[PDB]
Design an enzyme around this catalytic site. Sequence first.
Site, PDB file in Angstrom:
ATOM      1  N   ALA B  33       2.716   1.711  -1.528  1.00 27.92           N
ATOM      2  CA  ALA B  33       2.224   1.995   0.137  1.00 27.92           C
ATOM      3  C   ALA B  33       2.299   3.392   0.033  1.00 27.92           C
ATOM      4  O   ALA B  33       3.373   4.029   0.211  1.00 27.92           O
ATOM      5  CB  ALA B  33       2.872   1.424   1.058  1.00 27.92           C
ATOM      6  N   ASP B  34       1.282   4.218   0.002  1.00 33.48           N
ATOM      7  CA  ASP B  34       1.177   5.875   0.129  1.00 33.48           C
ATOM      8  C   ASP B  34       1.220   6.228   1.669  1.00 33.48           C
ATOM      9  O   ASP B  34       1.392   5.399   2.351  1.00 33.48           O
ATOM     10  CB  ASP B  34       0.033   6.218  -0.635  1.00 33.48           C
ATOM     11  CG  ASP B  34      -1.390   5.840  -0.003  1.00 33.48           C
ATOM     12  OD1 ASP B  34      -1.352   5.402   1.309  1.00 33.48           O
ATOM     13  OD2 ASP B  34      -2.314   5.953  -0.775  1.00 33.48           O
ATOM     14  N   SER B  35       1.063   7.577   1.646  1.00 30.78           N
ATOM     15  CA  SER B  35       1.415   8.003   2.990  1.00 30.78           C
ATOM     16  C   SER B  35       0.683   7.239   4.275  1.00 30.78           C
ATOM     17  O   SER B  35       1.268   6.912   4.828  1.00 30.78           O
ATOM     18  CB  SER B  35       1.125   9.423   3.063  1.00 30.78           C
ATOM     19  OG  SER B  35       0.992  10.154   4.396  1.00 30.78           O
ATOM     20  N   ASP B  37      -0.805   4.718   4.049  1.00 30.94           N
ATOM     21  CA  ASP B  37      -0.470   3.242   3.858  1.00 30.94           C
ATOM     22  C   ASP B  37       0.763   3.123   4.620  1.00 30.94           C
ATOM     23  O   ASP B  37       1.010   1.808   5.139  1.00 30.94           O
ATOM     24  CB  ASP B  37      -0.497   2.633   2.502  1.00 30.94           C
ATOM     25  CG  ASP B  37      -1.819   2.574   1.858  1.00 30.94           C
ATOM     26  OD1 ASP B  37      -2.777   2.531   2.506  1.00 30.94           O
ATOM     27  OD2 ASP B  37      -1.735   2.837   0.506  1.00 30.94           O
ATOM     28  N   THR B  38       2.191   3.778   4.366  1.00 31.09           N
ATOM     29  CA  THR B  38       2.978   3.709   5.175  1.00 31.09           C
ATOM     30  C   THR B  38       2.841   3.631   6.689  1.00 31.09           C
ATOM     31  O   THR B  38       3.443   2.991   7.332  1.00 31.09           O
ATOM     32  CB  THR B  38       3.982   4.390   4.753  1.00 31.09           C
ATOM     33  OG1 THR B  38       3.415   5.829   4.713  1.00 31.09           O
ATOM     34  CG2 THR B  38       4.438   4.352   3.228  1.00 31.09           C
TER      35      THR B  38
END
Lengths: 50, 72, 99, 49
Positions: B33-35, B37-38
């Site tokens: 989970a990227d930015s 996504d987080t």
Amino acid sequence: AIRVTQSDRDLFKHLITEATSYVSADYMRHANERRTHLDEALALRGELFG
Amino acid sequence: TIEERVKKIIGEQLGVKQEEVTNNASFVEDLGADSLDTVELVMALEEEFDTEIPDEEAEKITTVQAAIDYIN
Amino acid sequence: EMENVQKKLRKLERDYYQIREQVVSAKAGWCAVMRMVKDNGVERRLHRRELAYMEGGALRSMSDKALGALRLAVADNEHLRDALRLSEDPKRPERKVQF
Amino acid sequence: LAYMEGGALRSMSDKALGALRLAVADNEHLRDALRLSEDPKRPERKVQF
Ligand SMILES: *P(=O)(O)OCC(C)(C)[C@@H](O)C(=O)NCCC(=O)NCCS
């Protein structure tokens, strides 16, 4: 040989360019809209907290 | 239950399998989970329990264990 | 004055909750959308990140023009034609990925 | 059509215009009318077309 290759190259070029345009467009609009909604939600969240 | 609702939310917000999401499954590495996504994951977690988390307290959470801990 | 302002605060709270729920559902759907294109479609063909800086209207318009052409292009292959025609439904987007 | 939102109307118009571009390669006159009308702010143009 030249005729065969020219015909197939032209056909594949046409179909690929058209299909990519068509489908990537909807995909990218979905992505951009999701990003924009996230941005708006973040703005709302920050303003609400303040 | 809460400890499975967390996994459900994390999975369907990241697409990761229920098995991949252990309590120690770190989102950025284990779940990828990227930015954004987080951010969306914390957003959906807040929705799931219709509760809000402080900005620094929310960002502090980076692991399934920490997520459940704050939630419960 | 403060109570008057807190009224607007509560209105904005409601608005923010709505937006939050909407974005949650959007991300949930996009997960499966991605996991369809995740099969080697994303890289250079289906994702085209240079297009990130335009709006839904232009993208939809050009998509419709492209489809108007492609349908004639796909006049041959009945099942490929069916994929195109069905995915023509904007409400069910990932069809177009499968197509 | 009053019972549909603008987005659907725009989509339908563009989808029609696409096939029109494919077809009109035959006649210069219709092609010219199209190449002038396709812009949004000139509805009358499309009508002439
Ligand atoms: P990702 O690399 O796209 O990063 C997204 C983000 C972490 C920058 C974003 O989710 C975010 O946190 N934006 C708001 C930051 C903030 O606290 N702003 C103050 C209130 S407007």
